[PDB]
Design a protein around this ligand. Sequence first.
Ligand SMILES: Nc1ncc2ncn(CCCCCNC(=O)c3cc(-c4ccc(F)cc4)cc(O)c3O)c2n1
Ligand SMILES: [Cl-]
Ligand SMILES: [Cl-]
Ligand SMILES: [Mg+2]
Length: 213
Amino acid sequence: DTKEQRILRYVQQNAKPGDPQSVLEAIDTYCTQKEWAMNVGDAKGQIMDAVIREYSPSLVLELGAYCGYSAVRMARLLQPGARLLTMEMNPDYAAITQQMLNFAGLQDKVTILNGASQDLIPQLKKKYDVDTLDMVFLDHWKDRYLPDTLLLEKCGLLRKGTVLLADNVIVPGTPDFLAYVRGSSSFECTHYSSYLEYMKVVDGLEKAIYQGP
Ligand SMILES: Nc1ncc2ncn(CCCCCNC(=O)c3cc(-c4ccc(F)cc4)cc(O)c3O)c2n1
Ligand SMILES: [Cl-]
Ligand SMILES: [Cl-]
Ligand SMILES: [Mg+2]
């Protein structure tokens, strides 16, 4: 089997069904004690939680679900009726994510879209009935943060106040995205310094609030 299958099995055998917090703790324990994996982790996850609670978004888009760790983290804090759309282009990872959400009991709040951001973002309005997004969590290929931000704008998916929250802006880094949003009058940016998941290595999240064209 794969590392992702091992993470899922570990959750299934060490967390409580329908208890998202137990799911997060099981993933973090596995990834600390057994095998590192690119989940956002608890350090940056706590900052994510604070952001989600501040904004109480009704409709969130995630780019790059992986195993569903961040999807569980966000979805467990959403208000009744609020929704997460999470994109994962790797079909094996998309299946892990679905099963993770199912175990956590969050499947009614989340729709896992198996495809690439460049193909799916232009379909969001017509195919997934989206008007505008309240928040976007960027966690996919780091060289896609900037083009997909620009694509979301082109497609009319951002409104005044839409919160972009970007993982890994330090490691592996997203220098073009950071330079762009920090220099643009269309974004109000805040950096949240933290640590790479499961490691004593500095990383951070960037929040970039869209201000309109
Ligand atoms: N276009 C499109 N559309 C949709 C999609 N769905 C999935 N993908 C592709 C996602 C591929 C994984 C992206 N994430 C990372 O590479 C990542 C890496 C590290 C890391 C690694 C090694 C180190 F030594 C240190 C840090 C840490 C992180 O937290 C990361 O998130 C998509 N792409
Ligand atoms: Cl994650
Ligand atoms: Cl961590
Ligand atoms: Mg990441």
